Subunit: 216 residues, 6 copies
């Protein structure tokens, strides 16, 4: 990583933490922020380091490769490189593969990240990676939000737990999520709680809904 700005190598505890996260949690949504937390200030070299140390799950890692190549090709199309000798006071403009770390040295990445008018290649590559990771989290989610229904004896709290877990795995736009919250949550409750939630009103908070079905 680079920290306030000086360069540093990725620590053993960071790398081992990421490896154990992938081992234990597979591709649960909370893996993605963890990743973003273990890669704060990372160069593309550190990100490739974290990705390459994953044993197994090679189908998902290959999908991530293809996503990264898509984003790199899009960056290349939007940022066409100009022909000409690089001036003494300048550094070359990065291609998509340079941002992915495969065609750029560590010194070039540091140069882009520190030089005035900064090109944050680490955060760009990081965004691409998180995009692919979200694709993988969605594809590996074993449930659909439409199938989450409260059991007749299920306490309301557990039903809300499952519901918002699956919803977190859905990863649709926030307006769609608001719609699912305002419709499916009360729609798919069990009769006892469903009646009370209907009696609450269309604009009640989650706190009011959970405290309304607490004794029930």
């Amino acid at each position: 990583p680079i920290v306030q700005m000086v360069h540093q190598a990725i620590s053993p505890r960071t790398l081992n933490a990421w490896v154990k996260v992938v081992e234990e949690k597979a591709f649960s949504p909370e893996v993605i922020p963890m990743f973003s937390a273990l890669s704060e200030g990372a160069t593309p070299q550190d990100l490739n380091t974290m990705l390459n140390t994953v044993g197994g799950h090679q189908a998902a890692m290959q999908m991530l490769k293809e996503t990264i190549n898509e984003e790199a090709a899009e960056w290349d199309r939007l940022h066409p490189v100009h022909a000409g000798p690089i001036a003494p006071g300048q550094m070359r403009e990065p291609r998509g593969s340079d941002i992915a770390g495969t065609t750029s040295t560590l010194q070039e990445q540091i140069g882009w990240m520190t030089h005035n008018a900064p090109i944050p290649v680490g955060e760009i590559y990081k965004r691409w990676i998180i995009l692919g990771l979200n694709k993988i989290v969605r594809m590996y989610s074993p449930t659909s939000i439409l199938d989450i229904r409260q059991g007749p004896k299920e306490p309301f709290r557990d039903y809300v737990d499952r519901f918002y877990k699956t919803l977190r795995a859905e990863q649709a736009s926030q307006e769609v999520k608001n719609w699912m919250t305002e419709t499916l949550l009360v729609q798919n409750a069990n009769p006892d709680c469903k009646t009370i939630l209907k009696a609450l009103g269309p604009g009640a908070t989650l706190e009011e809904m959970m405290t309304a079905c607490q004794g029930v």
Copy 2:
């Protein structure tokens, strides 16, 4: 975090400590100071990092989202943003979502936190988060202070333990807590200890009360 003032990324041990705290202690009151201890000097990005890495408990995390949105709307109402181009020597005034970290970059948060006439967005957001966390601790408390009664064979120490545990989960105003201490504690003791505590006097310390029922 930011430390004396320079910026730093949240450490692997900090994040893993928070995750394990949520795993083990659920929503016991002591979780809240622990959180505040693992987030000293945090930017809103670090706080969102700690919140997002929680797997499961998504009902509580959603309630926390709604509380944070309430506090953000209140901040927006009390701090109406002015229309105009931001001057070269200034930074824009933060909205509620900026303080929550969802509409502000890390550089903007650092800018607000370091610039003279400082706006401590991390401590504001931290206060909102602790507010919602207290709501969750209260809602998930399984006992009421009125139901804590000393058993006939229960040593006084254990009764006081349970009593002040539940009282810590009550989270009412301090005057109400003083009233509960001065009334319910002696009122709900077992006959043997209750008589002695009555003989002590209305203004005895907890040390005097516990040493009075020690042999008893």
Copy 3:
């Protein structure tokens, strides 16, 4: 903590160490130095942090609260606050609650701790806390020094171990401790060792006493 003088947040390993100490050792005397060791250079905020993270034992923590309030009231009586506007080059004088961290910000505590003519609020509050902790250690001690008697088959070393353990839990003045050492230790030994220790003389060291009853 503040370290040579710059401010720092309490570390995850420190906090987890304190929590595990309270979990494992309850209120054994060695807990108190450990505490003082894990809080070297602490602001009142760090001390309140360490106290609040304790789950359970809420009777003892409440007793500690009452002791801290006693010491705070005494400080207020001895240091009556003067009425007047605080000058530009000065900081307000701290009340008892300010030293306890409940009515003072972190910046005010740092200000008192660093400014010339220093008011060490952290060490004052720390002294109050250690006072209450000693009260708790004494109240929770399950044995009296007068009941420690050597068994007929008990090796002298174990008897001395128990004796000075209980003595450490007694926490009377040092002259009283010297008296207990000079009287009860030989008085409550078993006949075999008691005779030899009588033959040693009234002014023998603990090394001489233990080596005198080593084979015996």
Copy 4:
């Protein structure tokens, strides 16, 4: 290691991490980036340190020795040393054994790594080491990419996992890997999924192929 540029010793956690990696993962491909991650900024002394601390696997370590000697002889052939006394403002040119750390002091390595017009002996030696490590990973791979065939009941995801694992162990040129991906993956699927993948088209992504055989 050397870090931004000052010198440092290899940490206990780094060394123990490498040792445990070799113990647990043997010579799985993910060992190689891990190595490169635990050796970022290393002098040849640190690299020899990491190699020598490996207990057992001495056949592989000897093969690595022979590879390093090959690369050293090639460097010597391409960089013939000139006869003459080293000038006061200069340092001698490194031989192959100097880069391997066996004939150069730590001070000479630091001198080459820091002096302007830098000779990065640590990264050169590191490249040689990774070359030999790739040889060992290939030789110890127990499967060939041509033998990876999907079972009749095997979910497509697992088949892709095995396939790209073995492919990662193959370590042929990237064009050859592209050919294997475009031919063998669909060629060696089971009939059910093979038909659907044929119906997809010759230019479908891995995401489209896996989502096409998801229910199947």
Copy 5:
């Protein structure tokens, strides 16, 4: 500790390491260097911290107290304090209790340790502590060097192990140790090895003696 010179608090890992050392190894000789290793650069406050955190073994800790008081009284006798007001540019001369940390603040200890013409109170107190610790190691040693005899089937290596272990616990002067090595080691071997060692000669090394009885 104080490190190159600035002051620092004793770390959680250091303290926990010392505690676990006392728990596991009791009073084996290797405890003493470990202590000296965990206390490098320590003020008397850090040393008292390490001593006080020991639970149990209070007989040994009391013996250590008495030894420290002996050394303190000797220091007081050899360094009689002069009567007079301390000058502005000076610090008072330390008594024995000041060196033991019981009558001196942390600031006074730092002052003595850093000021020119330095009084290393931490290393003096450390020497006293190691003296008492050696007394305890000797008293708690369960064997005498004269009783270490090689069994008829005991390999010579194990006999030498036991012998030099007990010898390390003896802690006599080095000339006495040389005598014990030159006499008792060969004297108390079993007949088979004893004859061969007699045939070696009076001035053979331990390597020659062990390789002479290796097959035997």
Copy 6:
């Protein structure tokens, strides 16, 4: 240790790592680089610290003492000390015992290690220690290189593993090792592999030999 140049105490993790290494691996060859890795930049005080903390194995530690005394006497013979008062701008020349840390303070060792025209006493003492450690590794090796023979069903890889393990324990000159490699390895293989290795040619690499007997 001393690090780029300032002095530091040996860390708890370093010391515990060394102790656990000695506990687990006894005197396997890989212990020696580990030692050299845990002692990079060490003063003689740190090295004596690491040696003294070893419990048990006192025969080997005594042999190490005798080796260190041999090297010290040789240094004394080659560097005869001159009689005369040490000048204000100078430090005394070190004897053999000074380099071993037994007759020199930490300040004197730092002085020799930092002063221009440097005497690296830590690396000299370190070389002596590694010499004795190699003696111990050789003496405690339970096998001879001449007895390593491939079993009739033993895969060639395992045979090479054992062979180069024992060879690493032999620690003869590199030319002798080359001879053993070129003769004994093929000489002591089983008939099946031996014939093929004879058919390979006298100058084949270890990679070619192992891949020749891979299927066999």
